[model samples]
Target: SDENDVVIIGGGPGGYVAAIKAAQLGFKTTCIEKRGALGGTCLNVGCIPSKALLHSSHMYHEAKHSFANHGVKVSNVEIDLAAMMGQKDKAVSNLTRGIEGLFKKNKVTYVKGYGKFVSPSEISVDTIEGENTVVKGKHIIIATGSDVKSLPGVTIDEKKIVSSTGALALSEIPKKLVVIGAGYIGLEMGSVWGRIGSEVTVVEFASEIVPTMDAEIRKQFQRSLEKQGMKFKLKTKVVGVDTSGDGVKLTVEPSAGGEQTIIEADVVLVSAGRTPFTSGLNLDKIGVETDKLGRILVNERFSTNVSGVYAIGDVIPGPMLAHKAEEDGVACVEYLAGKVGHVDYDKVPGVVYTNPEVASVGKTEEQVKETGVEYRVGKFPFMANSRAKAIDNAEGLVKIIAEKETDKILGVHIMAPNAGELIHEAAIALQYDASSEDIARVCHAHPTMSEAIKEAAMATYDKPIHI
Candidate 1:
């Protein structure tokens, strides 16, 4: 009668982290993943690979467009697609292997297989080696992440039509790339090829791109992308996609319905979004409740209706972000270990991994306004930040929103070089319920892009010196 303390499914950010935490808590943990790799999609195909391409493409862009401005003398700066992809592959493989090493160090059993619920506390795994095994645990956690959402009339063949996965592995940059959807994936992947000389056109059914972003910041962000040669067709819907010809053709019409227009592209990326992946889990058989959106329903403690069953990450109702998944996984296991677990969803930061990366934490201006709370606004442009100006990459701004009465920071949004890094300071501030004056009073290093954050904080409570 062998039984495990905990059994987890999926090995993405959520699954792996929970396995490690459960093992640390003295639980005999077993993690099953079907991806044939330890690190899952974020490490293998999504975040890591996309970032590698972004870095490579940015360097290529700089050599072609801005190298002379920096007084760097170079000749024949050309893109080697194979070399670039090789480097990305190397990084992905290294990290994935590193995760395997971690699992061994933590004494967590790693099984390569697709797992489904045979019972509430039992999982039947179809092994990669074509064997079947059943695992029983006192507790079961489902961390299966997500899959790319597809369009109605467009089929993703991963060639003429691609998803984020194919976008990362494109053999050559598309001469004309049409990206459907203006969310983070679409914009970031679009930026990848657009920087490297692809005619990137983004079509969105909504009037605005990055719909969750603050209105003002989203507008400026769209403008920055446009300046970088990315074209956008807002308030437009793709009715159909034709891949019969040498290139792909898209039939699109206005959101409100109008004359149809055909747009031709060498490659089309359908990045509508992602859907929670719970296809083979057999939730229905086990009676694990999920919402209409396919997101598993869980209590505050990450527990499902069935006792000893839990779910986390993209499979649950929250932001489908790697870091968020990691956070959720850690918290879910801690609760299982008879310890208090907490994750402040409001403090979770969302970052778009494009050049001059967009990052934000806490509520947006619209969200704050909807709350009917009196709020004061602050603004500081990177154009005034010394480091951004010195580096000659000043193209964005930092905006802060705080309660008017107490000056407590409600939200922090940044769009600048390494804004992803800058937003962490804001995240810490929010976690501590720090007021705008608190950030402004704190000494920030001079001649830094982060100083823009300090200045924006000052603008929130008082007058800013630089602006």
Candidate 2:
């Protein structure tokens, strides 16, 4: 009777996965994507493309910086920006096309158009060829992701002045690159360019880098960035930007108060985070509400207060993370289908894809203190980590925050190579509410970076094996 049983808007990791799962469960699923591809921001630009660049650049950087110590000899080390970009392009295209194949195999109808909520039970689609079509579904999902947030006076020209989006497609490595906002976006992109011989200057309005992360890890990360030849201009704000020529001139002043100074750079990257992408959904027509920052408001089940309407991903109030959004989409749709599904708010891990990557889950020391529970901290530096020492990346540490009484792991924070992958082990432990002793007792392979995690966990209960 209807075009589909369930229709998901936005074909990102969240939307695409939701569509596949819904279709597999015997629902006539349809996915409407405004873009030419199906991978949304994560696959198209954010995670996949940047990670490919990060990997390639890091390899090149290693060959230049550390190959000699490892007894590897090769001359004529140089960078080919175009070739690197092409590689990133190939990786992005492959993964996104893979999603397309999955959709076909799942028999999920794909709509290449912009979908707007037209009624409680229908959506209007605007195709690229300018055809307006209406489709009906019993249930609909709003998985539209976020967009780059623009500062008050700074506008992105995608060249002299840029955002994370433009930062990825850098045609040539600049002699001097100025990155605004020392958050994850700034740090990650800065790491990428800095690895390939760019002098990076990161300016942040906040006093610390990655302020959302644990403070101790922030200190280590800041020093590491500095060691990588990235300068920091903390507690500063860019009042204005001048992009009259090939380069950019930025006028900045201390966040507190100071004389404005102009800093010129060959490229200026404004990595000021992101906001929800909901420009064209016509939410007001159906009484769907958004928060002050323009993110759609949804209930715990990821349902809009408006009956028969739902929202998830960056459109709702949660960490604007792709995985978080995917989890939300799955839980919401499963619950909609009268199936049991849940999201673990506490066990979600966050990662910053920088060299000696920063990854964390659960509470921070500051958060633990607020709970008034007696807590203890255990730390193990990467210098003692055999893998890190072997690779010359011994600049970080693994920290464990846990309950003094129960020894239960409350939080795990790490700044080490492959930290993103390492955090998942801790994520699962915390999901089971495992104690620090539990992690320490597990037999971890020797001479591994993950040994830092085990050592830190051992130290949490005052019995570190290596330290």
Candidate 3:
């Protein structure tokens, strides 16, 4: 008898976290995962490994490019690419196992299987033993995350043609790295490889990188990346790709229809984006409602149309991020336990981990403008930031948008070192619905990058004290 109070499918951030939360809530919880490891794409391949490379390569880049500038004498600096990858693998293994350790500590049963719908409340798992095993629950939650989208004309050989996932494990550094898509994944991948000595070029179909980002910040970010030696071909399309030779040949043309030109690259990274992964789940067999985009429709509580069934994370309509997925998992189970848990979509932060990382929460200036809201903006550059200037890394800016009449903050965007870590302050501010003056009033410590936030708030309120 495998009946439980609840069952969760997929062991990604959302799946694993929700399993723990349900166990903590005193439910008989069980989670089924097929990856053989926990933590899903983010930990196993996508986020964790990519971040490790971004960090590792950044150190190498700094030692090679910027060490002397800091008055430090360095010698015989070389790329220990193998050791760097070994470190990344180590981190991923430890973190993945840690989730299993967490499951053991919490007493949540973990099943190794590819699970499929038996009914609204039942699943038949194709276990590792290659046998079907039925597990029943009062509730079934789907958290099966997403997969990298493949482009139409380009076939991924995972050697010359690679996805962001594939780019992470490239055995050798390519002479020329061409990244398609120009979103967070693409840019971050480009930054790491570029820093490691590849001539990086980003091919974006859209007019802009990070389409959802503030236009003003996007321009500054592009300029900063260009200066870092990353090339961009905006408003372009990869009509086809040829990987028959030693290097890849990408036939690129303007997205608005133009003559095609061949762009040769040692490796072509396909980071067009991710699509929801719902294959083999048998959601259709159980009559679960889904949209045309393959996203499950959910109510406020993350419940599906079918009774005793629910979905969260990338499978549902929302930002397909690990943190956001985790929030959805918590909120879904909390509602099941008759507790209140919700994530503010607007307040949820988005980050790009390129050099001078970009992070934003709440509305963009363009979004606010489109809404016809009378808003005021405050701007502060890291060039004016004392701490940033001291490191001679004084680049990028902080922007704050607030209601003109009420001075209530609508949004905040930041681009600088560790801007991902920095934007959490803005996240908390918007979550509590604080005003620009409110952040300005909070005396930030000097000689820190965060002080730029306070300075920007001051600008929003009146003018920056730095002025």
Best by lDDT: 1
Each prediction's whole-model lDDT (CA) = 0.89, 0.85, 0.88
**lDDT of model 1 at position 340:** 95
lDDT of 3 by residue, 28-92 (tens): 89899888798778898788898999999899988887889878888788888899889999999
TM-scores for all candidates?
Answer: 0.98, 0.97, 0.97
Alpha-carbon lDDT of model 3: 0.88
At residue 345, give the lDDT of candidate 1.
77
Better of 2 and 3 by TM-score: 3
Q: How much lDDT does candidate 2 score?
A: 0.85
In model 2, how large is the Cα lDDT of residue 91?
A: 88
135-164 per-residue lDDT for model 2 (tens digits): 778788888888988786487676767888
